[PDB]
Amino acid sequence: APRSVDWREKGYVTPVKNQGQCGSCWAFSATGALEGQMFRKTGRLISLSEQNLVDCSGPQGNEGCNGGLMDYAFQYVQDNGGLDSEESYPYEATEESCKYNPKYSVANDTGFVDIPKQEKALMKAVATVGPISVAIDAGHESFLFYKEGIYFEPDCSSEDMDHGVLVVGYGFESNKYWLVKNSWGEEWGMGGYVKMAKDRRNHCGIASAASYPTV
Amino acid sequence: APRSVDWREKGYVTPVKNQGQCGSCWAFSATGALEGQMFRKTGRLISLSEQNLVDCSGPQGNEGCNGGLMDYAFQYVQDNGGLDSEESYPYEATEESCKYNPKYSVANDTGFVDIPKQEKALMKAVATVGPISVAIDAGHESFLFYKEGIYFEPDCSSEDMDHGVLVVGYGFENKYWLVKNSWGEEWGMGGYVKMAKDRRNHCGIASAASYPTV
Ligand SMILES: *[C@@H](O)[C@H](C[C@@H]1CCNC1=O)NC(=O)[C@H](CC(C)C)NC(=O)c1cc2ccccc2[nH]1
Numbered sequence: 001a002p003r004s005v006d007w008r009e010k011g012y013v014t015p016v017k018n019q020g021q022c023g024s025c026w027a028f029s030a031t032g033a034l035e036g037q038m039f040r041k042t043g044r045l046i047s048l049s050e051q052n053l054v055d056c057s058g059p060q061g062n063e064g065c066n067g068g069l070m071d072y073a074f075q076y077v078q079d080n081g082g083l084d085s086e087e088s089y090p091y092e093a094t095e096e097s098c099k100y101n102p103k104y105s106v107a108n109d110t111g112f113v114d115i116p117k118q119e120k121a122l123m124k125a126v127a128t129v130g131p132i133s134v135a136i137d138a139g140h141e142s143f144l145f146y147k148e149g150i151y152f153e154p155d156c157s158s159e160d161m162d163h164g165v166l167v168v169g170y171g172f173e174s175n176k177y178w179l180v181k182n183s184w185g186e187e188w189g190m191g192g193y194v195k196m197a198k199d200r201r202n203h204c205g206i207a208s209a210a211s212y213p214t215v
Numbered sequence: 216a217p218r219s220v221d222w223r224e225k226g227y228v229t230p231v232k233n234q235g236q237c238g239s240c241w242a243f244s245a246t247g248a249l250e251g252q253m254f255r256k257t258g259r260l261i262s263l264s265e266q267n268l269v270d271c272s273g274p275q276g277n278e279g280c281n282g283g284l285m286d287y288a289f290q291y292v293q294d295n296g297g298l299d300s301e302e303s304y305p306y307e308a309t310e311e312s313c314k315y316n317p318k319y320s321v322a323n324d325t326g327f328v329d330i331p332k333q334e335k336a337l338m339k340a341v342a343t344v345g346p347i348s349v350a351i352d353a354g355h356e357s358f359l360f361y362k363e364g365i366y367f368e369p370d371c372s373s374e375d376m377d378h379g380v381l382v383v384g385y386g387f388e389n390k391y392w393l394v395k396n397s398w399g400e401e402w403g404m405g406g407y408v409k410m411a412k413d414r415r416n417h418c419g420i421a422s423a424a425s426y427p428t429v
C-alpha cells in the first residue's frame with residue numbers, strides 16, 4: 001500500500017468545522033465520511049448538514065447533542081433517502097425539530113461498512129476508499145493542548161472511545177501517524193487536525209470502531 | 216478576502232424569525248447585526264428583542280410596524296444604554312407601550328458604522344466584521360416567491376430599497392450574498408436567499424449597509 005495518503009490534496013475533504021458547545025462529534029464524523037464518498041462518486045465536494053443529523057436521527061439511536069454514532073447517522077441517511085446541504089440546513093449547536101427538506105438533499109447512502117478492528121485493515125480502507133469515520137479516546141489534556149508532531153498519550157484507551165473524528169490519510173515523519181480531522185475549529189491543533197500515532201497498539205482506539213458509508 | 220464566508224456555522228446567527236403582519240423588517244435586521252456583534256465580543260449568542268425596538272425607538276425616528284431603519288435602532292440601543300433579550304420582551308407583531316427594563320438588558324452598543332456604498336466594501340465588512348444589516352428592494356413577485364439558486368430580478372432597483380435584512384455571508388455556486396430574511400423558515404431556503412453579488416449593486420444591497428460597534 002502507499003506509505004503516505006492525504007485525501008485533502010485530492011479534493012475529498014471540506015474545511016474544518018466547529019461543533020461548538022454540543023456533543024455532535026459523531027455527526028461531523030459522519031458528514032465528513034459522506035462528503036468524501038459523494039465526491040468519489042460525483043466529483044463535487046459539497047458540505048453536508050450536521051444539523052439534519054442532530055435533529056432527525058433519533059429513531060436510528062442518536063441522541064443529538066448528548067451523543068451518537070456515525071453508523072446510526074449513515075443508517076438515517078439511507079432510511080431518509082437523503083441529507084440536506086450545510087448551506088440549506090445550517091449548524092446551530094443545539095437540537096431542533098426535524099426540518100429535513102428533500103428539495104435541498106445533496107447526498108444519499110446505501111448502507112455502511114464496519115472495518116475490522118485492525119490498524120492494517122483501517123490503512124487498507126483509507127488507501128482504497130477515502131476518508132473513514134473513527135472513534136477515539138480524546139478525553140485527555142494532552143489532546144486539548146495538541147499543537148504539532150505525532151500525538152501519543154500513555155493513558156489513552158484502545159477500548160473506551162468517546163469522540164468521533166475522520167481519518168483523511170496517514171504517513172510518517174522524515175514514526176507513523178494517522179491524519180485526523182477534528183471538529184473543534186481550525187484554531188485547535190494543526191489547522192484543526194491531529195497526527196495520531198499509527199501502528200502503536202491501536203493507540204486511542206482508532207481502529208476499534210471505524211466505518212464508512214456506501215453510496 | 217475569502218471567496219466564501221458563512222457566519223452561521225461559526226455561531227454568530229440566531230434561527231430565522233418571523234415578523235408576521237408588521238413592517239418590522241428593520242428591527243429584525245438590527246437585532247441580527249447586534250446578535251452577531253455581541254457574539255463577537257462575548258462568545259454568547261442571545262436572541263434580542265425586536266419588540267423592544269418597535270415599542271421604544273420612536274425618538275430615534277422609527278415608526279414601529281409602519282417602518283424604520285437599522286441605524287435608528289442602533290442609535291436607540293446606544294441612547295438607551297441597553298436592549299432586552301427576546302425571551303424577556305417577546306415579539307407581538309404590533310406596537311405596544313415601551314416596557315424596556317434594564318434588568319433584562321443583554322446587549323449594548325457604542326455607536327455604529329455605515330459601510331461605503333460599494334459591493335467591494337460590503338464584502339470586506341462581511342469578511343472582517345460579521346453579519347451586516349442591509350436594505351434591499353424586495354418588492355418584486357420573484358423575491359416574494361424565491362426558493363433556490365441565485366436571485367436576480369431585472370426590475371430590481373438600487374435606490375428604492377424597502378426591506379431590511381441581514382447579510383450573513385457570501386459565496387459562489389456566479390456569486391451571491393447569503394441573506395437572512397424575517398419571513399419565517401418556510402420562505403426561501405430555510406428563511407434565507409442567495410442574492411446576486413457583483414451584478415449592478417443588485418436590489419441596492421450595498422446602498423445602505425451598517426453594523427453596530429459594541
Ligand atoms: C463527541 O462530541 C461526543 C461527546 C459525548 C456526548 C455527550 N458527552 C460526551 O462527552 N461523543 C459521542 O457522541 C460518542 C462518539 C462515539 C463514536 C464514540 N458517542 C456517544 O457518546 C454516544 C452516546 C449514546 C447514547 C445512546 C446511543 C449511542 C450513543 N453514543
Ligand SMILES: *[C@@H](O)[C@H](C[C@@H]1CCNC1=O)NC(=O)[C@H](CC(C)C)NC(=O)c1cc2ccccc2[nH]1
Pocket residue numbers: 234237238239240241276277278280281282283284285349350351376377378379
Ligand atoms: C419591512 O418590514 C419594512 C416594510 C415597510 C414598512 C411598512 N410598509 C412597508 O412595506 N420596511 C422598512 O421598514 C424600510 C426598511 C429600510 C431599511 C429600507 N424602511 C421604511 O419603510 C422606513 C424608514 C423610515 C424612517 C422614518 C419614517 C418612516 C420610515 N419608513
